[PDB]
């Protein structure tokens, strides 16, 4: 027992340092947030007229508004006041450290951090984007990387630790190579015929599909009969793949003999599994099948323990909270429906709740589970499931990732021009004329219409810039030469950009600025910032590194697309066009008509006596295979996963009003898709990526990636600083006056005392709350002097002792800086207390931030936190280059969105402050969706194409389609951005992982 106890202490010691780092960073950021905005979110609107709150369209909750300029304003007739109630159920805010640590925890884990990021900005202001980017990068991305690296190192160390029929049979053995190609082509054609379905399905089309299925079944059955006849059970049946083929074909002909053909729709797509037969031709698909098999096979024990854990947690939650869930339904249920959409009453819903927790969404059900049970018991269960659940899942993801993978005078002029081009006077000029040109696009926003001078200046700048670029291009042509220029890869990335701009501007100036293709091309002017990729050394290097994996990414992309086509043909069959519903739309907010009044289309048509009954489809549905792909991508990115998963369960059949959870068991389809097209299809992409960088690195022979030569030598210098830190030993003072001061300073317990004092300062900083007694305010202020005075005295003592000898140490300079900063902050506060200098309290609470600079002293005294911070220090250049590339991508998409969706109707995620009409708002939205959070909410107001959800007919300034977007371009934009950002962030994670690996 003692041996296993010690073993458990071990394998936790591995995460000891990372856990302490997480706790300390969370505490520091909690203190920063608490000081910045405490009890600020409780700023609901109240009508000047008891309490009168207005509600934002589409949401019953009150509207958090705040005083300031950046912060979100409030409708006329309302004054933002510190109404005493927190926005979400009264359970989310920064009014105290205990409520600030949890908010930062859920901001690190990223669960629904979109709401927090758009609330705290609405209240405090837009300028607070800095805190959120900092906590996401330094907090979320960094801490998850380090935890993943800890688990990876632990498990890597574990891994490396240890008659007539006979005549026909003779003639039936043709088995020509043409036969296998023919059968494979037959499989592909069967799939492509079964993958062309839709809502229309004219009778001729239905008959054609039926006869096609019949003939293909006939061919497959004839082939199986011929093979079994030619072979015997010992030869034919003995094969695993033959058994699979026989099972699928017999399940296809039995249903082909059923009364209701594939009425189940699970059997109408059971034959579709045969596409696995393409495993022979496809190595990547073979590897995917191997991944799944070994996950269920050799590595099946880990999955079994995961499943039993999830089942046990779901059962415990049900048994403990179902009675309260039923007794208090009205407390958490939606305004109209009588039951919560997600609850824990019966085992199925408890298991779905636990799966939602494991999926990365827990607070939404946490809050509600607090207003139906004791806060203590419901808080433990929700947190323990997350930590244990996400640890066990990431334990499988690595186990699968380590077993399947790795287990005349003209020529003189030409030469002169060639030499001139290489000159710095032109190179640097072009580099910063490519930066200014890219930057100038940010001012082309929707509000630009209101500043005629600004747009005129911008168009002058654009014309001059394109003229300059044409001159540069023709000079480069006349110097370098046609073949030399066109050989390079980037040379033509500039040529096509220049031509796009040229033809667009020529069309505009030719009084032909009305052609739809011309307008679309002009909308592609967001490609101008792309021109800065070649010039910058680091961005060019990272671009080359990324392009080095296109061959290794295309195969996995194709395999994922096929394995998703299967699930997009299973979903289209199970439920197509069955998502339509009859809604009642009185104001923005609408209530689907109860099935008592209208239960089908004609009823919703004859009872239109209210003037508002509407029959409209869900925004994301399963009508055809393209929408199936979109609705599977939303479930894979885990955003919009409920609007298309609620429609599924409430639908009954074609042209019938959805009923409350009639298809309560249709959640299994989405659960299965999540499992397979997620944990078993991203694991493939990741393994392929960790072998395409491991290769090409062993090929590079250790050459650093994402880094230039100057950055490499700087990295080497810093690596030496990792051992050069110590300076010469300090001589002891000779005179008693300085000698006694020195020998008192340098002592066994001096450092312990200073650390304890910093800990006490942290304690007295965290005891702070919102709206506390004036007595406690005075106490904190006075103890905020007992500490600043003491630290300044100690710093001046150590400065007097040893004179300039100690100044050589860098961190001594750092702590001197923090102490003098505290003194300066106190002086500034005292001076600003005057009657002449008065500003918002935010200025007080931001100047008071110097204390955290004064409590960062523990870093120099830390054990492993300092090592991890050193690793981050070394990795900074690589992450800087990748961040430059990511910001360039974000800028491209910002310009695209600003040009394309500045008129959509403000619904769901979009608001009056998170629109696309301004560059700041566009950057805010793109930063939010960079992690694929709320992208569904931003997409939904674009999918709308007709009334009432959007009014296609609406002046909308000059906006076309009124308040309705273009679903095709919206889907392309958002899907491309999320995929590209996933690639860039996984590059960042790989860079950090390898930097810590060294
Ligand atoms: C959706 C698809 C979901 C799961 C994949 C199922 C794979 C079916 C393979 C059919 C062909 C066959 O029978 O080939 C067995 C291979 C032969 O390969 P070999 O041993 O000769 O080498 O054997 C193996 O690799 C091991 C068996 C096949 C790969 C592991 C599959 C484990 C999944 C189990 C149940 C899935 C239920 C799906 C529910 C809807 C979703
Ligand atoms: C996995 C892939 C399967 C995807 C499709 C799963 C089933 C989709 C929905 C469906 O058509 O399911 C068939 C039935 C009904 O389901 P329902 O949602 O209409 O419930 C109706 C409840 N009522 C009758 C009280 C109103 O299922 C039932 O009778 C309940 C028992 C079976 C539930 C589906 C089991 C699928 C098994 C998956 C393991 C692999
Ligand atoms: C990047 C951001 C975050 C990660 C930091 C990673 C570690 C940074 C190490 C900084 C460092 O080593 O530089 C200390 C500096 C410069 O000294 P030196 O390195 O040239 O070595 C001098 C001694 N010789 C000559 C023997 C080499 O010391 C001085 O002079 C005084 C100035 C001290 C500045 C460094 C502070 C680094 C730690 C915290 C920054 C704030 C983080 C905030 C996070 C968000 C919370 C809201
Ligand atoms: C590992 C590597 C990454 C792998 C990722 C795989 C993800 C696969 C799914 C991607 C989304 C596909 C998707 O949304 O469907 C294709 C989309 C949507 O369909 P639609 O017919 O336009 O919809 C109805 C139509 N709008 C209408 O007018 O009613 O409409 C289109 O036809 C647009 C296709 C382009 C955008 C989506 C697919 C390609 C994305 C590539 C991004 C790569 C970035 C690097
Ligand atoms: C939409 O749903 C409604 C209600 O289900 C359908 O109307 C219904 O039509 C049926 C068949 O005519 C009616 O059944 C009949 O009821 C009368 C007595 O009212 C009885 O004498 C007949 O023998 C038969 O049982 C049903 O009552 C009627 N319900 C109502 C209130 O309208 C409607 O046809 C559906 N429309 C579509 C196209 O989905
Ligand atoms: C129930 O009755 C209402 C009212 O007739 C129907 O709404 C109507 O829907 C049509 C088609 O969407 C609308 O046509 C267009 O509407 C826009 C926006 O008003 C307008 O700009 C166009 O000129 C054109 O009229 C129609 O206006 C709209 N009428 C109203 C006032 O709602 C609804 O479709 C009916 N629903 C059912 C299921 O019977
Ligand atoms: C479906 O939508 C319609 C239209 O919004 C709803 O009817 C509307 O109900 C409101 C009351 O919530 C009516 O406003 C007021 O009603 C009171 C009734 O005493 C009246 O005294 C006021 O002068 C005022 O009219 C509104 O007029 C009425 N509009 C109509 C005629 O459709 C309907 O209740 C909704 N039904 C469901 C089940 O969602
Ligand atoms: C580092 C950690 C994160 C710190 C927070 C993120 C970075 O700090 C944001 C604040 O500095 C914004 O400036 P103020 O505090 O002056 O707020 C604006 C107030 N007026 C000027 C409009 C009245
Ligand atoms: C991927 C697999 C190959 C491509 C499969 C492509 O799917 C083709 C279907 O979408 C065609 O039908 P629609 O969705 O255009 O529906 C027709 C709507 N009307 C004509 C009835 C109005
Ligand atoms: C690659 C895939 C090739 C797929 C070839 O697609 C052929 C058909 O799906 C075309 O169908 P339509 O888009 O014309 O829809 C007609 C539907 N109604 C009007 C008859 C109902
Ligand atoms: C997949 C491979 C390619 C397959 C191509 C299939 C082409 C054949 C299917 O194309 C569909 C169109 O012909 C229209 O749909 P129908 O054939 O049902 O005719 C209905 C006509 N109305 C009612 C719309 C006027
Ligand atoms: C949204 C994009 C995010 C970034 C990732 C995706 C990038 C896609 C590709 C964009 C750039 C495509 C052109 C640049 C990539 C290829 C080039 C990538 O770097 C070029 C070096 O590999 C080779 O140098 P050069 O091509 O200048 O010339 C050397 C001699 N050879 C190579 C010509 C024989
Ligand atoms: C089996 C255990 C349960 C697994 C739950 C599901 C575990 O996560 C599923 C992943 O597919 C989620 O992917 P990400 O969150 O990384 O988003 C990336 C989306 N794209 C960019 C790849 C499309
Ligand atoms: C309802 C449909 C669409 C989804 C479920 C598909 C199921 C039934 C599939 C996926 C995994 C498949 C099995 C995979 C492996 C083997 C072993 C082989 O020696 C015979 C076939 C057999 C036993 C398959 C039978 C069919 C199977 C169980
Ligand atoms: C049409 C206008 C706007 C832009 C024209 C850009 C032209 C010159 C660019 C666009 C894409 C380029 C091609 C992209 C990739 C390759 C493969 C390489 O192995 C040989 C050159 C070749 C074939 C390039 C030749 C130049 C090219 C065709
Ligand atoms: C190691 C310790 C500090 C970890 C945290 C301990 C717990 C008990 C801390 C976390 C936040 C703390 C609270 C933060 C702020 C206030 C307001 C103050 O006017 C009274 C104390 C009170 C209400 C604190 C009580 C103790 C508290 C709940």
The answer to whether 30 touches 97, Cβ cutoff 8 Å, is: yes
Residue nearest to atom 1 of ligand 12 (CA): 889
**Which atom belonging to ligand 12 lies closest to the Cα atom of 493?**
13
Q: Is the dihedral of CA 705, 707, 709, 711 positive or negative?
A: negative
Q: Which of 42, 343, 26, 69 is nearest to 913 (CA)?
A: 69
Distance CA 242, CA 965 (A): 50
Instruction: Please state how this structure was obtained.
Output: cryo-EM
At 530, which helix (H) or strand (E)?
none
Q: And the tokens for 859?
A: 């870093």
**Which atom belonging to ligand 15 lies closest to the Cα atom of 503?**
3
The answer to whether 938 touches 974, Cβ cutoff 8 Å, is: yes
Q: Which residues line ligand 10 (CB under 6 A)?
A: 192, 196, 200-202, 205
The residue written with tokens 């059900």 in the block is 365
State the DSSP string of 463-495. HHHHHHHHHHHHHHHHHH-HHHHHHSTTHHHHH
- Fold adopted by 300-402: Helix Hairpins (1.10.287)
CA angle 904, 907, 908 (to 5 degrees): 130
Phi-psi region of 197 (alpha: psi -120 to 50; beta: other; left: phi over 0): beta
Distance CA 769, CA 30 (A): 12
Residue 891: Cβ within 10 Å count: 23
**Hey, which residues does 769 pair with through a beta bridge?**
96
Q: And the tokens for 782?
A: 């006075």
The answer to whether 262 touches 573, Cβ cutoff 8 Å, is: yes
Q: Which residues line ligand 15 (CB under 6 A)?
A: 486, 492, 495-496, 499-500
Distance CA 755, CA 20 (A): 16
Distance CA 958, CA 627 (A): 30
Q: Where are the domains of the chain?
A: 2-161, 169-281, 300-402, 423-535, 736-860, 862-998
Distance CA 317, CA 378 (A): 9
Distance CA 819, CA 798 (A): 12
Distance 258 CA to ligand 14 centre (A): 21
Our answer on whether the CB atom of 627 is closer than 6 Å to any ligand 4 atom is yes
Q: And the tokens for 603?
A: 């009823």
**Which atom belonging to ligand 10 lies closest to the Cα atom of 204?**
20
- CATH code, residues 169-281: 1.20.120.350
Our answer on whether the CB atom of 137 is closer than 6 Å to any ligand 1 atom is no
Ligand nearest to the CA of 853: 3
Distance 44 CA to ligand 7 centre (A): 28
Ligand nearest to the CA of 537: 12
Q: And the tokens for 900?
A: 């394309």
Distance CA 922, CA 578 (A): 35
List all residues 6 or more positions away from 366 whose beta carbon is below 8 Å from its beta carbon. 378, 379, 382
- CATH code, residues 423-535: 1.20.120.350
| Torsion of Cα atoms, 484 then 487 then 493 then 498, to 10° | 40
Classify residue 138 by its DSSP letter: I
State the DSSP string of 731-794. PPPSSHHHHHHHHHHS-TTHHHHHHHHHHHHHHHHHT-BSS--HHHHHHHHHHTTHHHHHHHHH
The answer to whether 18 touches 150, Cβ cutoff 8 Å, is: yes
Distance 670 CA to ligand 16 centre (A): 43
The answer to whether 537 touches 885, Cβ cutoff 8 Å, is: no
The CATH architecture of the domain made up of 736-860 is Up-down Bundle (1.20)
Distance 196 CA to ligand 10 centre (A): 7
| Torsion of Cα atoms, 753 then 754 then 755 then 761, to 10° | 110
Distance 580 CA to ligand 7 centre (A): 24
Residue nearest to atom 22 of ligand 4 (CA): 968
Residue 627: Cβ within 10 Å count: 23
SS (H, E, C) 706-749: CCCHHHHHHHHHHHHHHHHCCCCCCCCCCCHHHHHHHHHHCCCC
Q: Is 793 exposed, middle or buried (0-12, 13-18, 19+ CB in 10 A)?
A: exposed
Cα-based distances in Å from 866 to 17, 20, 108, 142, 674: 10, 11, 21, 14, 39
Distance 501 CA to ligand 15 centre (A): 17
Our answer on whether the CB atom of 20 is closer than 6 Å to any ligand 3 atom is no
Catalogue the long-range contacts made by 217-221 (C-beta closer than 8 Å, 24 or more residues apart). Answer: 217/249, 217/252, 217/253, 217/256, 217/271, 219/186, 220/186, 220/249, 220/252, 221/249, 221/253
Distance CA 244, CA 346 (A): 36
List all residues 6 or more positions away from 373 whose beta carbon is below 8 Å from its beta carbon. 320, 321, 324
Helix (H, G, I), strand (E, B) or coil at 47: strand
Distance CA 616, CA 603 (A): 14
Our answer on whether the CB atom of 679 is closer than 6 Å to any ligand 13 atom is yes
Classify residue 96 by its DSSP letter: B
Distance CA 624, CA 380 (A): 43
Helix (H, G, I), strand (E, B) or coil at 188: helix
Our answer on whether the CB atom of 648 is closer than 6 Å to any ligand 2 atom is no
Distance 597 CA to ligand 7 centre (A): 15
Helix (H, G, I), strand (E, B) or coil at 406: coil
Q: And the tokens for 846?
A: 């931001």
Residue 716: Cβ within 10 Å count: 11
Distance CA 534, CA 431 (A): 10
Q: Which of 165, 278, 169 is nearest to 227 (CA)?
A: 169
Classify residue 694 by its DSSP letter: T
Distance 460 CA to ligand 6 centre (A): 45
The answer to whether 715 touches 429, Cβ cutoff 8 Å, is: no
Our answer on whether the CB atom of 565 is closer than 6 Å to any ligand 9 atom is yes
The answer to whether 435 touches 532, Cβ cutoff 8 Å, is: yes
Residue nearest to atom 8 of ligand 16 (CA): 98
CA angle 850, 853, 854 (to 5 degrees): 90
**Which atom belonging to ligand 11 lies closest to the Cα atom of 195?**
1
For residues 199-230, one letter each, b for 16 or more C-beta atoms within 10 angstroms of the residue's C-beta and e for the rest, the string is: beeeeeeeeeeeeebeebbeebeebbebbbeb
**Hey, which residues does 592 pair with through a beta bridge?**
583
Distance 517 CA to ligand 9 centre (A): 24
Q: Which of 528, 529, 620 is nearest to 974 (CA)?
A: 620
Our answer on whether the CB atom of 410 is closer than 6 Å to any ligand 6 atom is no
Ligand nearest to the CA of 247: 14
The answer to whether 680 touches 291, Cβ cutoff 8 Å, is: yes
Phi, then psi, of 78 in degrees rounded to 5:
-130, 145
CA angle 647, 649, 655 (to 5 degrees): 65
At 140, which helix (H) or strand (E)?
none
Q: Which of 815, 824, 814 is nearest to 849 (CA)?
A: 824
Distance CA 406, CA 284 (A): 15
Distance CA 102, CA 92 (A): 9
Our answer on whether the CB atom of 98 is closer than 6 Å to any ligand 16 atom is yes
Distance 369 CA to ligand 16 centre (A): 24
Our answer on whether the CB atom of 779 is closer than 6 Å to any ligand 16 atom is no
The residue written with tokens 């002792």 in the block is 801
**Which atom belonging to ligand 6 lies closest to the Cα atom of 608?**
1
**Which atom belonging to ligand 13 lies closest to the Cα atom of 932?**
17
Our answer on whether the CB atom of 247 is closer than 6 Å to any ligand 14 atom is yes
Residue nearest to atom 28 of ligand 1 (CA): 293
Our answer on whether the CB atom of 566 is closer than 6 Å to any ligand 9 atom is no
CA angle 922, 356, 890 (to 5 degrees): 20
Distance 619 CA to ligand 2 centre (A): 24
Q: To what resolution in angstroms was this structure determined?
A: 3.2
Q: And the tokens for 756?
A: 């304890």
**Which atom belonging to ligand 7 lies closest to the Cα atom of 610?**
32
Distance CA 6, CA 693 (A): 37
Distance CA 14, CA 5 (A): 15
Cα-based distances in Å from 346 to 315, 325, 369: 9, 10, 15
Distance 138 CA to ligand 13 centre (A): 22
Distance CA 158, CA 587 (A): 61
Sheet holding 613-616, edge to edge: 591-592, 581-584, 613-616
Ligand nearest to the CA of 844: 8
Length of the chain: 998
The answer to whether 913 touches 120, Cβ cutoff 8 Å, is: no
Phi, then psi, of 707 in degrees rounded to 5:
-135, 140
- H-helix segments, 109-202: 113-123, 129-134, 142-161, 164-171, 177-194
- In the structure, how many helices (H) and strands (E) does the chain have? 42, 3
Residue 98: Cβ within 10 Å count: 10
Our answer on whether the CB atom of 138 is closer than 6 Å to any ligand 4 atom is no
Helix (H, G, I), strand (E, B) or coil at 78: strand
Classify residue 114 by its DSSP letter: H
**Which atom belonging to ligand 7 lies closest to the Cα atom of 611?**
32
Our answer on whether the CB atom of 4 is closer than 6 Å to any ligand 8 atom is no
**Hey, which residues does 583 pair with through a beta bridge?**
592, 614
List all residues 6 or more positions away from 259 whose beta carbon is below 8 Å from its beta carbon. none
Distance 492 CA to ligand 15 centre (A): 6
Q: And the tokens for 517?
A: 């293709």
Residue nearest to atom 4 of ligand 6 (CA): 611
The residue written with tokens 């856990």 in the block is 19
Distance 100 CA to ligand 15 centre (A): 54
At 615, which helix (H) or strand (E)?
strand 613-616
The answer to whether 693 touches 705, Cβ cutoff 8 Å, is: yes
Our answer on whether the CB atom of 196 is closer than 6 Å to any ligand 11 atom is yes
State the DSSP string of 542-607. HHHHHHTTHHHHHHHHHHHHHHHHHHHHHHHHHSSSTT-EEEE-SSSS-EEPPTTT--SHHHHHHT
Our measurement of the distance from residue 869's CA atom to the centroid of its chain's CA atoms, rounded to an integer in Å, reads: 25
Our measurement of the distance from residue 876's CA atom to the centroid of its chain's CA atoms, rounded to an integer in Å, reads: 22
Cα-based distances in Å from 200 to 193, 196, 658: 16, 11, 20
The answer to whether 274 touches 285, Cβ cutoff 8 Å, is: no
Q: Which of 461, 551, 459, 471 is nearest to 509 (CA)?
A: 459
Let me know if domain 862-998 sits in CATH 2.30.30.100. Answer: no
| Torsion of Cα atoms, 49 then 53 then 56 then 59, to 10° | -150
Classify residue 441 by its DSSP letter: G
Residue 482: Cβ within 10 Å count: 9
Mutate to test the pocket of ligand 6, among 584, 614, 944, 962 (most ligand atoms within 8 A of CB): 614
Distance 381 CA to ligand 16 centre (A): 22
Distance CA 888, CA 894 (A): 10
List all residues 6 or more positions away from 935 whose beta carbon is below 8 Å from its beta carbon. 637, 639, 640, 929, 974, 977, 978
At 108, which helix (H) or strand (E)?
helix 97-108
The answer to whether 382 touches 369, Cβ cutoff 8 Å, is: yes
Mutate to test the pocket of ligand 8, among 68, 128, 855 (most ligand atoms within 8 A of CB): 128
CA angle 204, 209, 215 (to 5 degrees): 125
List all residues 6 or more positions away from 218 whose beta carbon is below 8 Å from its beta carbon. none
Distance 603 CA to ligand 5 centre (A): 10
As a whole number of Å, the end-to-end CA separation of the chain is: 36
Our answer on whether the CB atom of 968 is closer than 6 Å to any ligand 14 atom is no
- Gyration radius of the chain's alpha carbons: 33
Our measurement of the distance from residue 51's CA atom to the centroid of its chain's CA atoms, rounded to an integer in Å, reads: 38
Q: And the tokens for 323?
A: 């009675």
Q: And the tokens for 232?
A: 């015997």
- H-helix segments, 256-362: 283-296, 300-327, 329-332, 347-358
Our measurement of the distance from residue 172's CA atom to the centroid of its chain's CA atoms, rounded to an integer in Å, reads: 57
948: preceding bond cis by omega (within 30 degrees): yes
Distance 578 CA to ligand 5 centre (A): 21
- H-helix segments, 801-839: 810-832
At 379, which helix (H) or strand (E)?
helix 375-403
Mutate to test the pocket of ligand 7, among 596, 610, 657 (most ligand atoms within 8 A of CB): 610
Distance CA 963, CA 907 (A): 11
The answer to whether 345 touches 325, Cβ cutoff 8 Å, is: yes
Q: And the tokens for 509?
A: 């100036």
The answer to whether 276 touches 289, Cβ cutoff 8 Å, is: yes
Query: Is there a common fold for 423-535 and 862-998?
Result: no
Residue nearest to atom 19 of ligand 1 (CA): 240
Our answer on whether the CB atom of 675 is closer than 6 Å to any ligand 2 atom is no
Beta strands in 372-517 (DSSP E): none
Q: And the tokens for 49?
A: 């007229």
Our answer on whether the CB atom of 473 is closer than 6 Å to any ligand 8 atom is no
């Amino acid at each position: 027992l003692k041996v296993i106890v010690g073993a458990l202490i071990h394998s936790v010691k591995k995460l000891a340092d990372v856990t302490i780092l997480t706790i300390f960073c969370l505490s520091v950021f909690a203190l920063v947030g608490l000081q910045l905005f405490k009890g600020n979110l409780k700023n609901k609107c109240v009508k000047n007229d008891p309490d009168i709150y207005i509600n934002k369209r589409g949401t019953s909750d009150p509207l958090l508004c705040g005083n300031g300029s950046d912060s979100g304003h409030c409708p006329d007739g309302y004054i933002c006041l510190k109404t005493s109630d927190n926005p979400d159920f009264n359970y989310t805010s920064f009014d105290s450290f205990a409520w600030a640590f949890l908010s930062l925890f859920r901001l690190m884990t990223q669960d629904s951090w979109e709401r927090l990021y758009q609330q705290t900005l609405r209240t405090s202001g837009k300028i607070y984007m800095i805190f959120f980017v900092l906590v996401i990068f330094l907090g979320s991305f960094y801490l998850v990387n380090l935890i993943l690296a800890v688990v990876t190192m632990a498990y890597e160390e574990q891994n490396q630790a240890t008659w007539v029929k006979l005549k026909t049979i003779l003639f039936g053995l043709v088995t020509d190579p043409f036969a296998e190609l023919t059968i494979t082509l037959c499989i592909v054609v069967n799939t492509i015929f079964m993958a062309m379905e839709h809502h229309g399905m004219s009778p001729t089309f239905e008959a054609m599909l039926q006869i096609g299925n019949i003939v293909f079944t006939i061919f497959f059955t004839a082939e199986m009969v011929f093979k079994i006849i030619a072979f015997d059970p010992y030869y034919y049946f003995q094969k695993k793949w033959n058994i699979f083929d026989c099972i699928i074909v017999t399940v296809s002909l039995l249903e082909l003999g059923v009364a209701k053909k594939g009425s189940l729709s699970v059997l109408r797509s059971f034959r579709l599994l045969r596409v696995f037969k393409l495993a022979k031709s496809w190595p990547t698909l073979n590897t995917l099948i191997k991944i799944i098999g070994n996950s269920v096979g050799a590595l099946g024990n880990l999955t079994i323990i995961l499943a039993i854990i999830v089942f046990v947690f779901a059962l415990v939650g049900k048994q403990l909270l179902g009675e309260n869930y039923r007794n208090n339904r009205k407390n958490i249920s939606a305004p109209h429906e009588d039951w919560p959409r997600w609850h824990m009453h019966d085992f199925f819903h408890s298991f779905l709740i636990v799966f939602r927790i494991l999926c990365g969404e827990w607070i939404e059900n946490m809050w509600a589970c607090m207003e139906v049970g004791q806060k203590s018991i419901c808080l433990i269960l929700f947190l323990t499931v997350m930590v244990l659940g996400n640890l066990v899942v990431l334990n499988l993801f690595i186990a699968l990732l380590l077993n399947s993978f790795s287990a005349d005078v003209g020529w003189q002029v030409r030469k002169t021009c060639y030499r001139i081009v290489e000159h710095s006077w032109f190179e640097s000029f072009i580099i910063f004329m490519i930066l200014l040109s890219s930057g100038s696009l940010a001012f082309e926003d929707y509000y630009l219409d209101q500043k005629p001078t600004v747009k005129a200046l911008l168009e002058y700048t654009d014309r001059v810039f394109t003229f300059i670029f044409v001159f540069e291009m023709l000079l480069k042509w006349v110097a370098y030469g046609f073949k030399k220029y066109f050989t390079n890869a980037w040379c033509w990335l500039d040529f096509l950009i220049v031509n796009i701009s040229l033809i667009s501007l020529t069309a505009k100036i030719l009084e032909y600025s009305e052609v739809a293709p011309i307008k679309a091309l002009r909308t592609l002017r967001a490609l101008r910032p792309l021109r800065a990729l070649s010039r910058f050394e680091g961005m060019r290097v990272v671009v080359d590194a990324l392009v080095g994996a296109i061959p290794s990414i295309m195969n996995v992309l194709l395999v994922c697309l096929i394995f998703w086509l299967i699930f997009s043909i299973m979903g289209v069959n199970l439920f197509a066009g069955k998502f339509w519903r009859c809604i009642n739309y009185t104001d923005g907010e609408f209530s689907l008509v109860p099935l008592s009044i209208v239960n089908n289309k004609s009823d919703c048509k004859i009872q239109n006596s209210t003037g508002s009954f509407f029959w409209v489809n869900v925004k994301v549905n399963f009508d055809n295979v393209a929408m199936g792909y979109l609705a599977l991508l939303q479930v894979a990115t885990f955003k919009g996963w409920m609007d298309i998963m609620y429609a599924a369960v409430d639908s009954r059949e074609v042209n019938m009003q959805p009923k409350w959870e009639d298809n309560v068991y249709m959640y299994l389809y989405f659960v299965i898709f999540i499992i397979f097209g997620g944990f078993f299809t991203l694991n493939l992409f990741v393994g392929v990526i960790i072998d395409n960088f491991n290769q090409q690195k062993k090929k590079l022979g250790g050459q650093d990636i994402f880094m230039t030569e100057e950055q490499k030598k700087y990295y080497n210098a810093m690596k030496k600083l990792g051992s050069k830190k110590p300076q010469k030993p300090i001589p002891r003072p000779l005179n008693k006056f300085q000698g006694f001061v020195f020998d008192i300073v340098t002592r066994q317990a001096f450092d312990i005392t200073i650390m304890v004092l910093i800990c006490l300062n942290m304690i007295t900083m965290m005891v702070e709350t919102d709206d506390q007694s004036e007595e406690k305010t005075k106490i904190l202020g006075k103890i905020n002097q007992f500490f600043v005075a003491v630290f300044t005295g100690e710093c001046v003592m150590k400065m007097f002792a040893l004179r300039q000898y100690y100044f050589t140490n860098g961190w001594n300079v750092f702590d001197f800086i923090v102490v003098v900063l505290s003194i300066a902050s106190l002086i500034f506060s005292a001076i600003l207390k005057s009657l002449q200098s008065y500003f918002s309290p935010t200025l007080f609470r931001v100047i008071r931030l110097a204390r955290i600079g004064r409590i960062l002293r523990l870093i120099r005294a830390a054990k492993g936190i300092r090592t991890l911070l050193f690793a981050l220090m070394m990795s900074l250049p690589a992450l800087f280059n990748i961040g430059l590339l990511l910001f360039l991508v974000m800028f491209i998409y910002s310009i695209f969105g600003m040009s394309s969706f500045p008129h959509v109707r403000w619904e769901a995620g979009i608001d009056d402050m998170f629109n696309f009409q301004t560059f700041a708002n566009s950057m805010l939205c793109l930063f939010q969706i960079t992690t694929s959070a709320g992208w569904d909410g931003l997409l939904s107001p674009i999918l709308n194409t007709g009334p009432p959800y959007c009014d296609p007919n609406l002046p909308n300034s000059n906006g076309t389609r009124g308040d309705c977007g273009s679903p095709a371009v919206g889907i392309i934009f958002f899907t491309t951005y999320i995929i590209i950002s996933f690639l860039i962030v996984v590059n960042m994670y790989i860079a950090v992982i390898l930097e810590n690996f060294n």
